[PDB]
Amino acid sequence: TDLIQRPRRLRKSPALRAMFEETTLSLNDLVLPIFVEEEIDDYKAVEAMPGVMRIPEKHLAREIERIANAGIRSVMTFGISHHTDETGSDAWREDGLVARMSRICKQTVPEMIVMSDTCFCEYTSHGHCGVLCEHGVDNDATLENLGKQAVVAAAAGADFIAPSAAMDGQVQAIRQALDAAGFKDTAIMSYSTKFASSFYGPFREAAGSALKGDRKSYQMNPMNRREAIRESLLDEAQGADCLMVKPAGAYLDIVRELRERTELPIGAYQVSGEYAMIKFAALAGAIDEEKVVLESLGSIKRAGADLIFSYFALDLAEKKILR
Amino acid sequence: TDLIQRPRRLRKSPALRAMFEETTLSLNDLVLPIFVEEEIDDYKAVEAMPGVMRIPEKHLAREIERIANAGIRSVMTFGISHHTDETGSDAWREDGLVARMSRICKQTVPEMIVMSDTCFCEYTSHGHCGVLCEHGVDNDATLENLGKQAVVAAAAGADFIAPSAAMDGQVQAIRQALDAAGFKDTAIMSYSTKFASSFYGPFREAAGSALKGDRKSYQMNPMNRREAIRESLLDEAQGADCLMVKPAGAYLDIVRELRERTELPIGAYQVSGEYAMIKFAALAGAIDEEKVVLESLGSIKRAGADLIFSYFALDLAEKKILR
Amino acid sequence: TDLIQRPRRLRKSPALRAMFEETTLSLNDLVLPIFVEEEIDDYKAVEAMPGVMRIPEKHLAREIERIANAGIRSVMTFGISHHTDETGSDAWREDGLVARMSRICKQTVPEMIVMSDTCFCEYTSHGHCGVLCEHGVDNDATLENLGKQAVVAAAAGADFIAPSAAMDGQVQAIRQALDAAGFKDTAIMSYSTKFASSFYGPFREAAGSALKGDRKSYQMNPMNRREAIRESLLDEAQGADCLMVKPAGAYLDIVRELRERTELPIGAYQVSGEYAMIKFAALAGAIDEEKVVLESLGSIKRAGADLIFSYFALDLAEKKILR
Amino acid sequence: TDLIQRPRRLRKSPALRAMFEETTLSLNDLVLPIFVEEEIDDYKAVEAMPGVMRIPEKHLAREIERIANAGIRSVMTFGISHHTDETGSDAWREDGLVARMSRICKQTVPEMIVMSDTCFCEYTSHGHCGVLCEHGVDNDATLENLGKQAVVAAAAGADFIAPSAAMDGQVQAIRQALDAAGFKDTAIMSYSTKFASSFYGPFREAAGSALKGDRKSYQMNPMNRREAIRESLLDEAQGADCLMVKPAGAYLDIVRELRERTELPIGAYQVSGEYAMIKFAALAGAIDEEKVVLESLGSIKRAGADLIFSYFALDLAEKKILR
Amino acid sequence: TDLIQRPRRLRKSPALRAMFEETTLSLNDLVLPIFVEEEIDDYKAVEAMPGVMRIPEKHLAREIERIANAGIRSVMTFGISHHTDETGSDAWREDGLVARMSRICKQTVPEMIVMSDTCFCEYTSHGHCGVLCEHGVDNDATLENLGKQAVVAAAAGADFIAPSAAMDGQVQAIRQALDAAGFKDTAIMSYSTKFASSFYGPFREAAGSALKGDRKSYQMNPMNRREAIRESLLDEAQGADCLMVKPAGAYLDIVRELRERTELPIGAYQVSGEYAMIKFAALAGAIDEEKVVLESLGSIKRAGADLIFSYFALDLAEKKILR
Amino acid sequence: TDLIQRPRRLRKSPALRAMFEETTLSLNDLVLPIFVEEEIDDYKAVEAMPGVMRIPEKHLAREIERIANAGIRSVMTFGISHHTDETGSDAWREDGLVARMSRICKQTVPEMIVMSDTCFCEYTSHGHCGVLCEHGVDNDATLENLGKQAVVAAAAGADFIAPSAAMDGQVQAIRQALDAAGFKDTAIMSYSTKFASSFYGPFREAAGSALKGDRKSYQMNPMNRREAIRESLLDEAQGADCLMVKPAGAYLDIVRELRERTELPIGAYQVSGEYAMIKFAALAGAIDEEKVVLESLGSIKRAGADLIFSYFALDLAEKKILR
Ligand SMILES: *[C@H](CCCCCC(=O)O)CCC(=O)O
Ligand SMILES: *[C@H](CCCCCC(=O)O)CCC(=O)O
Ligand SMILES: *[C@H](CCCCCC(=O)O)CCC(=O)O
Ligand SMILES: *[C@H](CCCCCC(=O)O)CCC(=O)O
Ligand SMILES: *[C@H](CCCCCC(=O)O)CCC(=O)O
Ligand SMILES: *[C@H](CCCCCC(=O)O)CCC(=O)O
Ligand SMILES: [Mg+2]
Ligand SMILES: [Mg+2]
Ligand SMILES: [Mg+2]
Ligand SMILES: [Mg+2]
Ligand SMILES: [Mg+2]
Ligand SMILES: [Mg+2]
Ligand SMILES: [Zn+2]
Ligand SMILES: [Zn+2]
Ligand SMILES: [Zn+2]
Ligand SMILES: [Zn+2]
Ligand SMILES: [Zn+2]
Ligand SMILES: [Zn+2]
């Protein structure tokens, strides 16, 4: 044939595939979500998430030095509560689990970037992401409490307040409460586009949320691409330092669309259900885990994300697979 | 709080979420890939692809009829050969397996659109997608061969010749070859953007391809978003009736970018490893299969895919999940 | 002050600046240009290019091995001839210097991607980039010549034929010439947008080009941004596997504009005068070389360059500044 | 050959290269940054910047007539202080060096356009661009003082207040302070995109800033193209009359990107390190200075800049190289 | 009033308006159209074009030298024939007027770029731009003719063949004709978008064209903006080195639209009637000629014109209004 | 030739040129600017504007019935004053000339659309467009008076208040004053992009402005295309019902650019100098007036304007040339 065009020319060797590799993933792209249970003495393995386990609070300090030492520069704290009420009030206690989780990390490793998952689904009796009613999760009652929380997390050392509630106006809510209290420099990692997703399967088992029902009156419809972009652009207008798409894996078209519609940094969360799907298929021997893990993360980065939340971060770090 | 904008108003109930749902998935969207093994007696199920079976050519007509009753409009044919040589010429025999899968399918169900997987990886002794040489798979030697195959497939009744050899110029070669042979009406479903992906883990086992090494000198690098697009657009310029992104699951960005760069129909292949990841996590209790299968497939649709090749298609069809 | 937006939040620490850094430079990005002088005995260092040396063909294999050990993937070959005639035919000899630099390089290190600088300025008696006539450098006489050269280079093992004669139609002529000679697999790295720039000051000395006057009737005007783009796009239409902007340093706008006008890989050449400016100011104590070299190269990358031809590549490599 | 397209057609002669020159640089594009030291009797040559020297205040008046007479229509005043405190308070003194520098210029040459570099790095004990703390340079404490300064500079005759601090909200800060005090017509030349650059080498030697450390908690990361555009678009929203990219030379992709994202005029600063790199390479004989200077300035203009700050402005003016 | 934005700040003085002026006009931008009448003795001034004169071929070399001394780089040649037949073959004679105007010009001033007006309206007995038939001006009969003319012009020394017959396919025909004749280096300045405009009022008198009726079956309708663009883009596809909009004055929209639809140079012709309107109103005291001429020409430049054909060029040049 | 493309096909006949005419001009596009002198008994012909004359106020009523009867549906009133003070205060008198001019028109022809040129250049001693100072025309002092005027014009029946002062914030100024006084429905025809143009020659003679100097500290630079768009987009933000480009003729690139940047209606003013240039060239016999007038107006409409101010409107109307 007479093809002047031969794409295959640059795939002839490993050296050549390397010179022309358009995307590259490194360790500075990963944020390690960490699970921390108060009032427990020994490590609890999560079943649905092969290799992940709850860090007993009394060990938080040791592990976050371990995390820090393998090179992970950021963490997203999730707490498993033992003091859950109707409003989820522990979460905005001067020394609630939320605050302690932050304080212990920044104390133990000063330069470590601490993001605090700011919500109520793990601290509420009902397990919904906020204040519940004769109508459902009340949006504005939840914003007042998201603000109350933000300030104690900020106050306890988190570099980022990550509103995880999917409440309208949560970012603006949190910006003002943080400012008013003298926390003008504390940033917001907005879970801006957070879907009511079936990929969160393993997560209520991992961080013990006590909700039996669903979050579809606040977390958005997986199928709504226009609305997902709109969700994120509203948080930009409310001052978010960073936007986010969760889940990430089945929403890379969403991450790309958004990367072209804002100059802001974009995070993508590779959720428990994605980790679970990788882990359980490698066990059955169906796929090569390291291969599928690097390709998975790389696809996220290719779609446009600046930071990726992944539960594989530490192990990729330590086995020194990502430098 | 004075939020004028409140995304949650349209999420209040199931009726409102349905009124406003942006993307809807149907069975008209699904193409079912089928594996037929010649010269065997009973169905041989695939290990890494739980619930998937290798059909014995002797039941293929019983089967095409069952798929047809299910509501399914299209199938993609993949053959497991017993007559594998160095060039894989069972593929281009007037009566090779390839030609027999189409004629059986087309003969049993004349309404069925049969898409013929056009390659050599399952028919060569060495497992590569074509002619091997002292330097690698020869592009142009394989092109002449793909042509011979396409014409035997057309003549056997296949409505779509789908080149999966990831060879440069394949659409052009197949297009000429088909016109020259009086099949100017036979369409081409190009696997235009075909990545050298690790999500094909369970396919060497499912398809029975002999290959030991890698397909990186022809199948393209996962990280190259710009190249991905170039690949498909070169195929549009070559006359492909339909373009395709494969794998699809971790390439939703690619799907969306390409939807915006062409007016042509786009197919998306939810590959074997994707099928396996959902099965095993489901088996291991970590996720709700129905909810993940539906969400994964609809995501592919939301990103711009016109047609989605899925192994869950019959099951979704018969259980009447998608109409 | 009530600033909702505060860019500084993500600049507070080294850890945050790294999390959020948009562009990262690596050694995979660098191509090392090498000068080999035939018929000489010891290395002859270049005066205007402090630390750069003319390699004696008799050590080229010792050297390609050293570069190779450094981590370097690619080199661009420039030859200093002793056999210079009016058409510069040492360039198109089956055994000319051009063909010997490739074969030595390719023979010593078969993994090395050797890019062959394809021109006549270092091989003609008069120093021009081709055939001279009663009116100037003849475009089409030089095209036939570039073709002969490309084929001897391919046959010597060069993986890339890089036409630097700034002649109209060169990619097409070289592409045909290479296909006709059974090198349909040999790629073309076109110096597509090649400016008649004063940053090449130290190159007549480094390369030993005989030219006394100017190269303005073929190399293009620095001020023409629209022409710059036209130049490269004409080369994409002619089949170049890769495009290039040269010089790169003072043409970062050109790099960005072109990144937005093509999906093809783009190279950027940090020319001799750029190398010299950084050396001498560094020597004269005015700047920190490491910090300026790294920032200059990353800037090239930030603007859209896929590959950057730099004389600092080995030094950056061995001192292990870039991995 | 059969090329209908021959770009070379318009490069046949100097007359032709001229008719078709797309960009043109003149003297009205240059702003001359001038150095003025109080309490000194004789001119101080800067070492790192060959040909530049501090103007003793007692001579300011003579030189600015000289500047004005060669045709330079604008100046950017930089002061070398002898009264540096912790807050850098001299800079907002009714008759600080800042005010005197302006007053003396507008008095001496009424129609001369005076821009006043508004910052504190030259007037502070520590040499940081503002009010320093137990946390670092305090952003809002610095804005109150940037405003205080602006008003005395305005009051003393500067046509432009050029905030050089890289403090968030500095432009809005300065707009209000200027308005409130009756300086509604005094314009702001915002250093909107000002990187923490290694090209500023020679500058702490030239304007005596007493900082030992770096400005990376406020001046932005050289590698962040999206953020650089964002920085500039915020100052547009805050009322800046003019935007700016500093440094300019290795950031022409940035100047271009920005020229396409706003209708505002854009300045580009060719910093001390760029001047130094040109000057020291010409001395070593590596490049032709006039050639590299005009091409350097021309590239800046080509990228999209309306005004260029260059230390070569006066000498190009006088040697009558730019009219 | 609290206007943050105040456009007037940069209009306060002549110095500021000059600093910020977006478009600057020069003599390098001007092409001077010249009318040479063969077989006559003294200059014959044109009535409707006050100050414009028909040059007697016997002084053309005295004149080309005067224009040349003025600073003028280019001229467009228009001939007033005494040998007018039905096909206008004095135009394609080895020694016709057309060929003599170029050779005289090129012989007297070899630096001069001579653009040859390529048509038949001044050479045919009936005044039409080509061959007349029982149905109108024959497109293809005129194409063969334009070809013969272009080759005699090239051979006479003209650097630009400018087809003004408004015939379909003219660039292609002239391009082939010129290449075939070994003038692959002769450029083409196409009057690409040439309107059937009433601003040519004074040209039948100035050029001495015999036509009585209209040129609407070939010259295009003034109101068709979309067609205007199609016209020029078809000429870019045909290889024109330069495109043109004519008339220019009342087509500034066309100029801007086309600048945005091509990267090619664009010429703009300020036609005779435009020249006349400015003269007579000036004579009748209604306007200041210098100020209207300068503003009109700069407007053409602001709209995107690279080159402007103006009858005021020598006058502006000698009086030294534009340098 | 083999051109599949023949643009000439649709220009074969007058019927065909008509079916395919892209733009069309009718009478509903014209606004007739009318001149009205108070305290005079007989009509005053303007010299610089052949055919235009001042309407003595005592006849306004008769002529506006005449205007109305030929079909002109809108007028722009300009007054020649006999009571000119320093602030131009007559213009905001309950019964100033401004008010009377409006009142008399709406009284005499109710459905006639009356636009009131809102400025002070005809009512001031100095003739500048507002309040003059030790600094020049004071911007905000003028806005207070533009508002005062607006309300009496509104109050006296004008459908449009057309701020002609080129004062920053004039549209917002006028919106509020009109609202506050209960004139929420009175529209603003903003002279949004009004250049300091040399085409206004005949106008100070036509409406007796007593200014000797120029308006370049407020009317914008003819050469600033970016700024012209910016000027107009600010008036959109301030509530203008309609935008405008004046002059129109040499600024059609500006009208086009703007038509693509807003959804608002756009007016274009064919100024006195344009009329003058048409009129005086037709007298000399250089052009056909009706031809050049219709092509002139048509070009304006083609560039994108919705309404055109033309002094030829009445005569085109009456001679029934435009229906
Ligand atoms: C949201 C929990 C935060 C995101 C965790 C993502 C993951 O699955 O790893 C609500 C989750 C729920 O349905 O309980
Ligand atoms: C390509 C075979 C078609 C795609 C795989 C279908 C799937 O469900 O995985 C090459 C497969 C290979 O690498 O052998
Ligand atoms: C082109 C030679 C290749 C580019 C120069 C490489 C460098 O580092 O300067 C012509 C050079 C010349 O003008 O002789
Ligand atoms: C910013 C100083 C103003 C810009 C001067 C640019 C130049 O280098 O000429 C801080 C510079 C520092 O690091 O001291
Ligand atoms: C075209 C002649 C070239 C354009 C006119 C130049 C001018 O200044 O008017 C045809 C002219 C005609 O209609 O005869
Ligand atoms: C602005 C007067 C209103 C526009 C009239 C346009 C025309 O010329 O017909 C100031 C004009 C001046 O310079 O006096
Ligand atoms: Mg939201
Ligand atoms: Mg392909
Ligand atoms: Mg070229
Ligand atoms: Mg800023
Ligand atoms: Mg045409
Ligand atoms: Mg305005
Ligand atoms: Zn929650
Ligand atoms: Zn295959
Ligand atoms: Zn060369
Ligand atoms: Zn500073
Ligand atoms: Zn003609
Ligand atoms: Zn006025």
CATH number of the domain that residue D286 is part of: 3.20.20.70
Query: How many angstroms away from the CA of F37 is the closest CA of chain D?
Result: 37
Minimal Cβ distance to A9: which of C13, C21, C185: C185
Alpha helices in chain E, H assignment, sequence order: 14-20, 60-70, 97-108, 139-156, 170-180, 203-207, 225-237, 252-259, 272-283, 289-302, 313-318
Minimal Cβ distance to F48: which of E286, E296, E303: E286
Q: Give dist(CA E166, CA D55) in Å, integer.
A: 64
Torsion, CA E103, CA E109, CA E111, CA E113, rounded to 10 = -50
Q: Whose CA is nearest to atom 3 of ligand 6?
A: F164
Q: Whose CA is nearest to atom 2 of ligand 5?
A: E164
* 3-class SS letters over A234-273: HHHHCCCCEEEEECCCCCHHHHHHHHCCCCCCEEEECCHH
Residues present in chain C in total: 323
Question: Which residues of chain D make contact with A264, given a CB cutoff of 8 A?
Answer: 226, 230
Distance of CA D42 to the CA centre of its chain: 25
C106 is catalytic: no
Asked if F287 lies within 8 A of E276 by C-beta distance, the reply is yes
Assess whether chains F and A touch, using the rule of 3 or more C-beta pairs within 8 angstroms.
no
Closest to C232 measured CA to CA, from C199, C175, C189: C189
Asked if D284 lies within 8 A of C48 by C-beta distance, the reply is yes
Q: Give dist(CA D161, CA D171) in Å, integer.
A: 9
Please name the helix (run of DSSP H) or strand (run of DSSP E) that holds residue D313, with its range, or none.
helix D313-318
Quote the number of domains for chain A. Answer: 1
Ligand 1 atom at minimal distance to the Cα of residue A204:
14
Question: Which residues of chain D make contact with F230, given a CB cutoff of 8 A?
Answer: 263-264
Buried b (16+ CB within 10 A) or exposed e, C273-282: bbbbbbbbbb
Within 10 angstroms of residue D257's Cβ, the number of other Cβ atoms is: 25
Query: How many angstroms away from the CA of D135 is the closest CA of chain A?
Result: 11
Amino acid at F13: S
* Cα Rg of chain E, angstroms: 20
Using CA coordinates, name the residue in chain F closest to E136.
F12
Q: Which of F167, F226, F233 to mutate to test the interface with D (most CBs of D within 10 A)?
A: F226
B215 belongs to an annotated ligand binding site: yes
Using CA coordinates, name the residue in chain E closest to F282.
E277
Question: Which residues of chain F make contact with E250, given a CB cutoff of 8 A?
Answer: 249, 252, 295-296, 299
Measure E174 CA to ligand 6 centroid, in angstroms: 48
Query: How many angstroms away from the CA of A186 is the closest CA of chain C?
Result: 7
Q: Whose CA is nearest to atom 6 of ligand 3?
A: C271
C-alpha angle E287-E288-E294 in degrees, rounded to nearest 5: 115
Enumerate the active-site residues of B. 194, 246
Please name the helix (run of DSSP H) or strand (run of DSSP E) that holds residue E194, with its range, or none.
strand E193-194
Q: Give dist(CA C234, CA F10) in Å, integer.
A: 33
The Cβ-side half-sphere exposure at D191, using a 13 Å CA radius, reads 27
Ligand 2 atom at minimal distance to the Cα of residue B201:
9
Q: Give dist(CA A143, CA A159) in Å, integer.
A: 20
Q: Please pick, among C44, C58, C216, C246, the residue that the annotation labels catalytic.
A: C246
Distance of CA A172 to the CA centre of its chain: 20
**Is residue A187 a contact partner of residue A244, using CB atoms and an 8 Å limit?**
no
State which of C203, C216, C251, C275 you would mutate to test the pocket of ligand 3, scoring each by most atoms of that ligand within 8 A of its C-beta.
C203
Interface E–F counts its CB contacts (< 8 A) at 240
Measure C200 CA to ligand 3 centroid, in angstroms: 5
Strand locations in chain D, DSSP E? 30-37, 44-45, 53-56, 74-80, 113-118, 160-163, 187-188, 193-194, 243-246, 266-269, 307-309
Q: Provide the β-strand partners of residue D162.
A: D117
Measure F155 CA to ligand 16 centroid, in angstroms: 55
**Is residue D189 a contact partner of residue D151, using CB atoms and an 8 Å limit?**
no
Question: Which residues of D fall in the annotated binding site for Zn(2+)?
Answer: 119, 121, 129
Q: Which of D9, D21, D190, D295 to mutate to test the interface with C (most CBs of C within 10 A)?
A: D295
Question: Which residues of chain B make contact with A6, given a CB cutoff of 8 A?
Answer: 139, 168
Burial class (CB within 10 angstroms; exposed 0-12, middle 13-18, buried 19+) of B181: middle
Q: Give dist(CA F109, CA F74) in Å, integer.
A: 11
Which residue range forms the structural domain that includes residue C269? 1-323
Decide whether any atom of ligand 5 lies within 6 Å of the E248 Cβ: no
* 3-class SS letters over chain C: CCCCCCHHHHHCCHHHHHHHCCCCCCHHHEEEEEEEECCCCCCEECCCCCCCEEEECCCHHHHHHHHHHHCCCEEEEEEECCCCECCCCCCCCCCCHHHHHHHHHHHHCCCCEEEEEECCCCCECCCCCCCEECCEECHHHHHHHHHHHHHHHHHHCCCEEEECCCCCCHHHHHHHHHHHCCCCCCEEECCCEEECCHHHCCHHHHHCCCCCCCCCCCCECCCCHHHHHHHHHHHHHCCCCEEEEECCCCCHHHHHHHHCCCCCCEEEECCHHHHHHHHHHHHCCCCCHHHHHHHHHHHHHHCCCCEEECCCHHHHHHCCCCC
Measure B110 CA to ligand 14 centroid, in angstroms: 27
E119 belongs to an annotated ligand binding site: yes
The Cβ-side half-sphere exposure at D154, using a 13 Å CA radius, reads 25
Decide whether any atom of ligand 6 lies within 6 Å of the F238 Cβ: no
Q: Give dist(CA D179, CA A289) in Å, integer.
A: 63
Within 10 angstroms of residue E42's Cβ, the number of other Cβ atoms is: 10
* Cα Rg of chain D, angstroms: 20
**Is residue B48 a contact partner of residue B206, using CB atoms and an 8 Å limit?**
yes
**Is residue D294 a contact partner of residue D25, using CB atoms and an 8 Å limit?**
yes
Q: Give dist(CA C246, CA C192) in Å, integer.
A: 8
Minimal Cβ distance to A222: which of B201, B284, B295: B295
Pocket of ligand 2 (CB under 6 A): B 121, 164, 200, 203-204, 209, 211, 215, 271-272
Decide whether any atom of ligand 3 lies within 6 Å of the C118 Cβ: no
Please name the helix (run of DSSP H) or strand (run of DSSP E) that holds residue F188, with its range, or none.
strand F187-188
Q: Provide the β-strand partners of residue C32.
A: C75
Q: Give dist(CA B82, CA B104) in Å, integer.
A: 18
Q: Whose CA is nearest to atom 1 of ligand 3?
A: C164
Q: Whose CA is nearest to atom 3 of ligand 4?
A: D164
Asked if D9 lies within 8 A of E239 by C-beta distance, the reply is no
Burial class (CB within 10 angstroms; exposed 0-12, middle 13-18, buried 19+) of A23: middle
Query: How many angstroms away from the CA of E263 is the closest CA of chain C?
Result: 5
Nearest ligand to residue E5 Cα: 12
Return the SS3 of E306.
Answer: coil
User: In sequence order, what are the residues at sequence separation of 6 or more whose Cβ sits closer than 8 angstroms to the Cβ of residue E255?
Assistant: E245, E248, E266, E268, E300, E303, E304, E305, F253
Closest to B234 measured CA to CA, from B149, B317, B309, B167: B167
State which of E137, E203, E308, E311 you would mutate to test the pocket of ligand 5, scoring each by most atoms of that ligand within 8 A of its C-beta.
E203
**Is residue D103 a contact partner of residue D61, using CB atoms and an 8 Å limit?**
no
Experimental method, per PDB record? X-ray
Which residue bears the tokens 């003298």?
A182
